[PDB]
Amino acid sequence: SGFRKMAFPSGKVEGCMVQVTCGTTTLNGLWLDDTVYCPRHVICTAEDMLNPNYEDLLIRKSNHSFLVQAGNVQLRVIGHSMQNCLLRLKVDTSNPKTPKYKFVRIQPGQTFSVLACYNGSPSGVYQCAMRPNHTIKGSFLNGSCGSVGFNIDYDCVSFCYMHHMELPTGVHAGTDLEGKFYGPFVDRQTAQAAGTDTTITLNVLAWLYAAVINGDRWFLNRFTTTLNDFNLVAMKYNYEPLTQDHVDILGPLSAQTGIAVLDMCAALKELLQNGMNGRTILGSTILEDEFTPFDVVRQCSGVTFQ
Amino acid sequence: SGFRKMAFPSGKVEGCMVQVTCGTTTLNGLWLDDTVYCPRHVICTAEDMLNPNYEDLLIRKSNHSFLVQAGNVQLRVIGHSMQNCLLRLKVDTSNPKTPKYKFVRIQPGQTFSVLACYNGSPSGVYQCAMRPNHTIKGSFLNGSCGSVGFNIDYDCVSFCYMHHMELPTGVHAGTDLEGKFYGPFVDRQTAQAAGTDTTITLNVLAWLYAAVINGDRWFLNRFTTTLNDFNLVAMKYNYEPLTQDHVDILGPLSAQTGIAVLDMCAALKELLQNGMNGRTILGSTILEDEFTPFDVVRQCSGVTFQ
Numbered sequence: 132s133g134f135r136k137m138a139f140p141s142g143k144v145e146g147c148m149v150q151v152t153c154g155t156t157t158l159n160g161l162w163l164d165d166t167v168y169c170p171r172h173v174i175c176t177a178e179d180m181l182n183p184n185y186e187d188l189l190i191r192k193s194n195h196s197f198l199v200q201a202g203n204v205q206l207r208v209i210g211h212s213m214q215n216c217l218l219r220l221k222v223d224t225s226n227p228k229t230p231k232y233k234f235v236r237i238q239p240g241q242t243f244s245v246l247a248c249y250n251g252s253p254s255g256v257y258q259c260a261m262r263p264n265h266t267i268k269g270s271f272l273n274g275s276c277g278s279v280g281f282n283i284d285y286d287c288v289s290f291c292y293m294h295h296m297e298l299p300t301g302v303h304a305g306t307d308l309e310g311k312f313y314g315p316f317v318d319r320q321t322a323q324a325a326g327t328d329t330t331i332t333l334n335v336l337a338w339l340y341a342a343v344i345n346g347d348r349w350f351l352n353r354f355t356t357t358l359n360d361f362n363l364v365a366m367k368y369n370y371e372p373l374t375q376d377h378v379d380i381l382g383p384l385s386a387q388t389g390i391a392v393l394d395m396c397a398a399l400k401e402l403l404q405n406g407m408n409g410r411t412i413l414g415s416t417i418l419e420d421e422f423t424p425f426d427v428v429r430q431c432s433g434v435t436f437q
Numbered sequence: 438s439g440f441r442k443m444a445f446p447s448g449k450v451e452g453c454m455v456q457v458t459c460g461t462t463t464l465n466g467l468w469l470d471d472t473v474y475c476p477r478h479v480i481c482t483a484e485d486m487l488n489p490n491y492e493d494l495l496i497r498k499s500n501h502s503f504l505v506q507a508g509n510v511q512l513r514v515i516g517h518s519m520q521n522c523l524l525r526l527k528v529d530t531s532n533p534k535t536p537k538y539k540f541v542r543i544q545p546g547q548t549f550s551v552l553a554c555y556n557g558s559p560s561g562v563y564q565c566a567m568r569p570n571h572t573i574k575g576s577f578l579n580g581s582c583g584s585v586g587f588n589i590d591y592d593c594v595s596f597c598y599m600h601h602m603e604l605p606t607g608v609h610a611g612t613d614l615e616g617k618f619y620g621p622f623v624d625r626q627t628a629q630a631a632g633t634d635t636t637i638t639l640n641v642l643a644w645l646y647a648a649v650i651n652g653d654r655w656f657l658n659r660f661t662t663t664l665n666d667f668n669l670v671a672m673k674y675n676y677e678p679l680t681q682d683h684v685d686i687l688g689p690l691s692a693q694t695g696i697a698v699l700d701m702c703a704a705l706k707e708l709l710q711n712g713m714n715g716r717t718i719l720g721s722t723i724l725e726d727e728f729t730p731f732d733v734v735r736q737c738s739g740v741t742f743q
């Protein structure tokens with residue numbers, strides 16, 4: 132029993148975290164085989180941050196300008212190249228702790244674990260969701276550039292996020308491991324801001340199913356809804372429209388609990404329209420939207436508490 | 438910026454998790470040096486769970502009755518002894534991944550990371566608080582016996598919790614690493630239940646300070662309170678009484694924000710008496726009580742957003 136925001140065990144990633152230094156700039160890098168990945172912002176001159184030309188900045192560097200520290204060992208850089216907003220640094224030694232890994236581009240609404248890191252030293256691990264506006268609600272201080280987000284399945288690490296910057300609202304933006312930003316952000320100082328965000332409807336529905344699996348049904352009702360009738364209410368409360376694809380994804384949870392998806396949609400519609408009435412669901416008074424249907428099946432029992 | 442429930446990186450603990458099997462019972466164990474720690478419930482006969490005599494159950498076992506699996510390697514048990522509600526199994530090989538470690542008995546209100554594990558395989562990591570009633574609000578399924586709770590400081594792992602059982606309300610009970618239960622619970626089938634719980638006042642205060650550090654002050658007011666006047670209101674809302682020791686602990690956070698502790702106590706008193714008014718604090722509508730003053734200093738910037 133119970134339901135917690137749960138991260139993947141971080142050991143396989145901790146063994147890949149290194150420190151990368153260019154002159155007076157230090158941040159974190161990811162050491163896989165004989166390559167070290169890090170934000171290209173490491174090469175950025177202090178008193179120019181508005182208009183950096185990274186191609187012109189990087190042509191001026193040699194291999195030995197990069198200091199890469201793995202623990203108390205220095206790694207020798209024997210090659211470098213730019214890939215979108217990251218640098219790939221080839222080093223003289225293959226990381227002996229490299230796990231089986233893959234690079235993946237996560238989709239909005241999906242969740243992943245973040246290993247917050249400073250000066251190449253992991254500091255904490257937490258779970259978060261890629262918001263529809265392509266930011267994450269992380270917890271990061273100065274020095275966290277290059278911290279990594281990931282998921283794990285069967286001893287394989289799927290890296291999906293490298294951290295770059297904090298936006299003015301206090302949320303966070305970064306790239307995949309090919310160096311392509313999530314969302315419309317760029318790695319320079321501009322007036323860029325997070326766009327308007329939405330609530331992840333599919334995840335709220337999954338979390339209501341988790342609540343039933345664990346034994347709570349107080350929020351159900353005797354009604355059903357059409358998909359389009361639900362989406363009219365979703366629009367008014369800044370929820371994402373529900374699609375048939377999302378209904379299909381909820382199939383297994385629907386089967387496990389015996390609650391048809393559109394019946395749960397009617398329950399959510401009443402919750403949006405009437406509020407919580409001073410009640411909680413899995414310990415929360417807010418409708419939680421950072422658990423995916425996958426996360427619920429992973430964490431919840433396969434047997435409903437009927 | 439940001440504030441998340443953040444666990445310690447789990448790699449140093451993952452390297453210690455093994456599987457322990459007695460006949461048809463399997464659970465998790467902790468392998469440090471040449472010793473494997475696990476719940477003594479592993480030796481329990483299926484159709485007797487009410488009145489087990491563990492001394493009589495254990496005298497009937499040999500060293501070779503214990504199967505201990507570390508990955509795909511079998512460890513040879515060459516000795517066993519009971520310590521309170523745990524077994525200490527000496528094995529033929531020292532764990533090469535043993536970290537610098539210590540055993541600590543955590544106090545009520547303190548926080549720690551849980552590495553949830555099944556069949557000796559770590560599955561997830563999350564943060565939780567030792568409740569005043571000596572339970573934790575974990576997330577555990579069958580097979581989680583022997584999962585470990587811990588804190589890390591400067592590469593040293595402080596183990597404080599080994600998981601045993603789920604109580605009827607869905608919360609969780611277990612022992613320290615000397616095998617002594619937290620709270621008045623015993624490792625057999627009884628009508629035992631979690632006692633009445635309370636809200637951890639010191640932690641709520643710390644979390645309000647975290648909210649100010651990150652830039653939010655909406656809940657402050659122009660009033661102050663006496664310690665005893667606050668405790669009269671705390672009693673009525675099922676908060677723990679605040680002590681001078683707790684006021685002293687809040688010193689550094691008070692200094693960083695310029696808000697005297699008893700002034701924050703007045704702010705909390707108004708929040709309890711008037712409610713939230715449909716507002717949030719660090720993203721929450723409930724007053725959060727599972728962050729210690731230490732946790733706040735660890736995660737929050739040292740510079741207040743004034």
Ligand SMILES: *C(=O)c1ccc2c(ccn2S(=O)(=O)c2cccc([N+](=O)[O-])c2)c1
Binds near residue numbers: 172297317320
């Ligand atoms: C780390 O990898 C990193 C740190 C600062 C970065 C960055 C890309 C751009 N910048 S920045 O110009 O210093 C910056 C920081 C915060 C916000 C914004 N912004 O324009 O909103 C820019 C990478």
Ligand SMILES: *C(=O)c1ccc2c(ccn2S(=O)(=O)c2cccc([N+](=O)[O-])c2)c1
Binds near residue numbers: 464601602605624
């Ligand atoms: C694992 O270490 C473990 C599993 C079950 C245990 C246990 C000690 C006692 N029991 S139990 O008798 O099966 C049990 C389980 C849940 C609740 C209660 N209870 O009396 O409340 C007992 C250790």
